[PDB]
Amino acid sequence: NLDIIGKRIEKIKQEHETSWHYDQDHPYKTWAYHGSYETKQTASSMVNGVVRLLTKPWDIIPMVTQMAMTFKEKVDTRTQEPKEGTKKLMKITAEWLWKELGKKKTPRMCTREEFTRKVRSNAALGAIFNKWKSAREAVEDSGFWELVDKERNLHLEGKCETCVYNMMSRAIWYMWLGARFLEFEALGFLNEDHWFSRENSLSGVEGEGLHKLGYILRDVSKKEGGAMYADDTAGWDTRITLEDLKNEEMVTNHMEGEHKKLAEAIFKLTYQNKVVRVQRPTTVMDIISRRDQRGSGQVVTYGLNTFTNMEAQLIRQMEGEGVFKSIQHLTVTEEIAVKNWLVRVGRERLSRMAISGDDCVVKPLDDRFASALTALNDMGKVRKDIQQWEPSRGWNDWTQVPFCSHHFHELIMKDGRVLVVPCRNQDELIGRARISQGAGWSLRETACLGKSYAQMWSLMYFHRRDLRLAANAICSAVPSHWVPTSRTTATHEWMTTEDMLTVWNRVWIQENPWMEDKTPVESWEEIPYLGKREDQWCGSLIGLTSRATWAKNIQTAINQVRSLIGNEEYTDYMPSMKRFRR
Numbered sequence: 001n002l003d004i005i006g007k008r009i010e011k012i013k014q015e016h017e018t019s020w021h022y023d024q025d026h027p028y029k030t031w032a033y034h035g036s037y038e039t040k041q042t043a044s045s046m047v048n049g050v051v052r053l054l055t056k057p058w059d060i061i062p063m064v065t066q067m068a069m070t071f072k073e074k075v076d077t078r079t080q081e082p083k084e085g086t087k088k089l090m091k092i093t094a095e096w097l098w099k100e101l102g103k104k105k106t107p108r109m110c111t112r113e114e115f116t117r118k119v120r121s122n123a124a125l126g127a128i129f130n131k132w133k134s135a136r137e138a139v140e141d142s143g144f145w146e147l148v149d150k151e152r153n154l155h156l157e158g159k160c161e162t163c164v165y166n167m168m169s170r171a172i173w174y175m176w177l178g179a180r181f182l183e184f185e186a187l188g189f190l191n192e193d194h195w196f197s198r199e200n201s202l203s204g205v206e207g208e209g210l211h212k213l214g215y216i217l218r219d220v221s222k223k224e225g226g227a228m229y230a231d232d233t234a235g236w237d238t239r240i241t242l243e244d245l246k247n248e249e250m251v252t253n254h255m256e257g258e259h260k261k262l263a264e265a266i267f268k269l270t271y272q273n274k275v276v277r278v279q280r281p282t283t284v285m286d287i288i289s290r291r292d293q294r295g296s297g298q299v300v301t302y303g304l305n306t307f308t309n310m311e312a313q314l315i316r317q318m319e320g321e322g323v324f325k326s327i328q329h330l331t332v333t334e335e336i337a338v339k340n341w342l343v344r345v346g347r348e349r350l351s352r353m354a355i356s357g358d359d360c361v362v363k364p365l366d367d368r369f370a371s372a373l374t375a376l377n378d379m380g381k382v383r384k385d386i387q388q389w390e391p392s393r394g395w396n397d398w399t400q401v402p403f404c405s406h407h408f409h410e411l412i413m414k415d416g417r418v419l420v421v422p423c424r425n426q427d428e429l430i431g432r433a434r435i436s437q438g439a440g441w442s443l444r445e446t447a448c449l450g451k452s453y454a455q456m457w458s459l460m461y462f463h464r465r466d467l468r469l470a471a472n473a474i475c476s477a478v479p480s481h482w483v484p485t486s487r488t489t490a491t492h493e494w495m496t497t498e499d500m501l502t503v504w505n506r507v508w509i510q511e512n513p514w515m516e517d518k519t520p521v522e523s524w525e526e527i528p529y530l531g532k533r534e535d536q537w538c539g540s541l542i543g544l545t546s547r548a549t550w551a552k553n554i555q556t557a558i559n560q561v562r563s564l565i566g567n568e569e570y571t572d573y574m575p576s577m578k579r580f581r582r
């Protein structure tokens with residue numbers, strides 16, 4: 001308690017000595033409260049006019065238009081301590097999983113150099129407004145690094161002064177850049193060196209890309225076993241126990257020198273003890289602490305979520321296979337059975353899973369998995385939208401399985417080759433493309449964001465008739481040489497000025513390990529769509545009068561946007577589709 005977080009508390013207390021009160025009508029039950037001080041401020045979703053003007057039929061579809069308008073009583077809940085058999089199952093499994101992830105990887109510090117390059121090409125690292133404006137400025141100034149150095153030597157001493165969270169089913173915890181560097185220096189290796197790649201971790205998909213996830217699910221489908229299970233957890237980040245955070249910290253056992261001490265300090269001082277500053281309307285800043293739940297950078301969060309999800313799902317598999325009999329207590333021969341299962345079949349069992357952070361698909365040995373719920377519930381990984389002891393509903397067809405907000409279609413090209421393509425409800429795709437985040441967008445920047453969506457659609461969703469047509473219209477309405485942009489950057493092969501047919505060929509043919517024949521495609525008309533009825537099922541407007549008028553008059557919509565942007569160089573991409581090819 002206060003010995004580890006006090007220094008951090010004491011510091012904030014002083015900087016607002018003119019305000020510090022122990023407010024008595026404070027909400028917190030599960031968060032420890034420490035005091036308050038005065039503040040006053042709040043970023044809503046702006047519409048991308050370039051995409052909206054070229055998607056007129058969707059102006060009257062509430063599922064699209066409502067997306068652009070507009071649970072902190074789940075962050076204030078508590079998770080019971082797992083039983084002794086559960087804690088033992090997790091410790092054995094975690095120990096074994098780090099060893100296997102570590103067999104072909106070397107833990108190592110990430111550097112100021114690596115950190116700087118990242119800031120100067122815009123990843124959502126999560127810093128704050130103050131002393132320097134943007135992160136881009138602080139990185140170049142030696143002052144910052146002296147701040148970073150003071151804290152760094154403090155961490156080597158087992159103490160912390162400035163590593164404090166800022167709160168804001170979502171709750172994103174920004175830290176100041178300095179503390180972000182210290183987290184990256186010690187744990188960035190997990191992402192930077194691809195510890196959760198499929199090749200390295202067998203269950204993971206880190207770095208895979210949407211054009212790969214469908215093929216991966218189809219490979220899992222080829223295994224002998226039962227249904228495919230894809231149970232979502234209710235508020236995964238809020239269900240991370242202190243026992244979870246202690247099995248995650250066992251990565252430090254693989255480390256040495258400085259690194260081991262620095263990683264140990266991140267885990268002890270910022271993860272297993274946390275200090276947060278929260279905005280309350282009634283408006284003050286609340287300085288609250290707690291030991292458990294997830295609160296890291298979004299990138300370290302992703303890797304430790306994948307690790308702990310891999311661990312949970314191996315254990316649920318162990319329960320289905322009857323490797324242990326009860327979570328109350330493991331016997332001595334049960335420990336040696338668990339260790340032996342891991343050594344004998346652990347890698348084969350990892351390969352039966354696709355795990356992206358809190359998101360999973362498992363193809364277990366058989367359907368005993370569906371009612372193997374005691375360890376899963378006792379670890380606190382409670383399933384969403386199903387009663388706690390009701391057996392899981394599995395999927396019989398890999399093409400029906402939800403994973404990473406998608407499902408996947410099998411699509412045969414007129415030449416017999418097989419594409420496995422990502423898909424989701426088309427209203428969700430159009431609704432998201434019509435939205436921009438943040439202020440001070442020029443017409444040119446708005447156009448270049450619309451071009452990023454259009455190029456993603458040509459690469460990932462070319463099989464949806466409305467999206468191929470709308471993608472061609474947007475790429476026709478935006479100047480040919482203007483570069484696609486995004487403000488929060490998987491693979492992103494659509495972010496380029498290269499010809500989209502050439503990028504399609506590289507992604508889907510040349511570099512696709514599931515495609516044996518490397519014959520390039522010479523036009524978009526060789527590239528197939530879903531069946532007309534399947535396209536409607538997945539939200540296509542084909543068949544509606546609104547959509548026919550839109551398609552027929554598309555050059556008038558393109559010309560409206562060209563007139564707004566002004567006399568620039570434009571390409572007509574509509575003749576890439578047969579109906580506009582005369």
Ligand SMILES: CNS(=O)(=O)CC1CCCCC1
Binds near residue numbers: 466551577
């Ligand atoms: C490929 N271009 S398209 O989507 O316009 C083709 C038709 C599909 C059947 C209904 C009318 C539109």
Ligand SMILES: [Zn+2]
Binds near residue numbers: 151155160162163179
């Ligand atoms: Zn610190």
Ligand SMILES: [Zn+2]
Binds near residue numbers: 407409423424538
């Ligand atoms: Zn679909």
